[PDB]
């Protein structure tokens, strides 16, 4: 109150553990009086590919297609495809953006990668030059809520997967920080599929409990040191 | 040399710098007498989304859709969508897989993320157990050939982007090593859009020239220490 939250959600199945985490987020933030909007990417059949269809009308150089250039020019000339601009409006209005997704290959599912690629365009999310703290979304908070197959033990420095902080870098630092977001600590729900039906309840409740005081949190220091150092 | 190479290529524009690096790879490996295949993802309109359309058989749990479970089962039964099995055949026969792409948000473009999500399914690329050094694609080589916006100086330990190896972790370790690939050293072509005509020519020829001796290289040690140091 008054805050707007966007949840960008990437799971195929409403009954999934990801689905429950998104639904608990909506319930709790709605209870607090927050304005809440969900981009359900799979349900939207959201387009992940960066193509020339992302620019309507005619191209600033139709001899050689350079996605970054064309989308930058399209943004400034209000000529982007409406799926993209619809998302940009939600992001522009949001105080907090939560990404809710299963880890796919130490990263976001391709549908959500496509949302980052196509929604966070130069002119909108950053300029060249125009980034990290010179980055256009400054003032906003972002938070990754990730589920994994691997256990917390696997996700340690000398575990097989390495520290979870290591896979966070391209998302938190290369993407969210670059665009100016302040980054709240990741929520990581380790290994729901190997249960139990009570540790699972416990993970959902912990996320619900944490959303209670989310506006009280300070952002992480989004540095090489936080991700890799001691 | 008597080897099969698959190049998975992710750029919209044939006259691009990526397009040039892909063609010099084809020209050079072809000159050597290697068998060469390119999956040009945008030209194929490759589907990046992990959906229930990827399975054509009776689902193992049609009440709650779990993509990993259903694709693992579909792989064993041969009920995967044929676009996926077409790619698996390329990978299965390849001795070396080269990925040629521009860096998008410290990672692969979503279209290529989708190829990794959908093509490297359980049963085919790994099993549980059967990953990392026991991955199912053991004996195969993989190499990332990546172009950036950011300069080499930006991609250093104390540059704004951090070391370039930091962003390689989810792709080299989390994906290729997990599937059992031995990983060759990345080719990184920094900031070609900024570069002079001659520096650009020199980056293309350094790749061509490296490929002349590719079959003699050893893989990297794909470990936390290699990627992060200390
Ligand atoms: C292409 C691909 C790549 C992957 N790469 C990685 C990787 O790099 N690293 C890694 O660690 N893992 C990886 N995984 C595994 C993936 O991250 C996990 O499968 C995923 O995060 C599981 O979350 P989910 O929502 O799908 O679980 P679900 O299967 O949907 O749920 C787990 C259980 O919770 C139940 N549930 C639903 N709601 C509730 C509720 N409120 N209370 C209690 N239980 C509930 C479900 O019924 C289910 O039994 C990959 C998977 C795929 C398909
Ligand atoms: C959505 C998005 C996200 C991005 N995220 C990142 C990121 O996280 N980090 C980062 O560093 N960068 C990022 N970038 C920038 C991106 O990586 C670069 O734009 C891309 O790597 C440049 O490669 P290219 O093939 O498109 O260059 P091009 O624009 O195609 O090439 C530059 C020049 O080389 C010329 N050329 C082509 N062939 C030859 C040849 N044979 N010899 C000499 N010159 C030739 C071309 O004509 C052109 O003039 C991002 C870009 C986008 C669009
Ligand atoms: C890289 C990785 C680490 C892990 O711990 N679990 C995984 C998994 C996958 C694919 C990849 C991983 O599918 C099911 O579970
Ligand atoms: C994250 C990042 C680092 C960088 O150095 N350059 C970038 C770039 C982009 C998008 C992101 C980046 O579009 C053009 O250039
Ligand atoms: Zn940062
Ligand atoms: Zn490794």
Swiss-Prot record, chains A, B:
Single GO cellular component term: extracellular exosome
Residues annotated as binding FAD: 11, 17-20, 103-106, 147-150, 155, 193, 200
Coiled-coil intervals, chain numbering: none
Key words, A-Z: Cytoplasm, FAD, Flavoprotein, Metal-binding, Oxidoreductase, Phosphoprotein, Zinc
Transmembrane helix as UniProt keyword: no
Remaining remarks: Uses dihydronicotinamide riboside (NRH) rather than NAD(P)H as an electron donor.
Protein family (similarity comment): Belongs to the NAD(P)H dehydrogenase (quinone) family.
Protein name: Ribosyldihydronicotinamide dehydrogenase [quinone]
Species in which this protein is naturally found: Homo sapiens
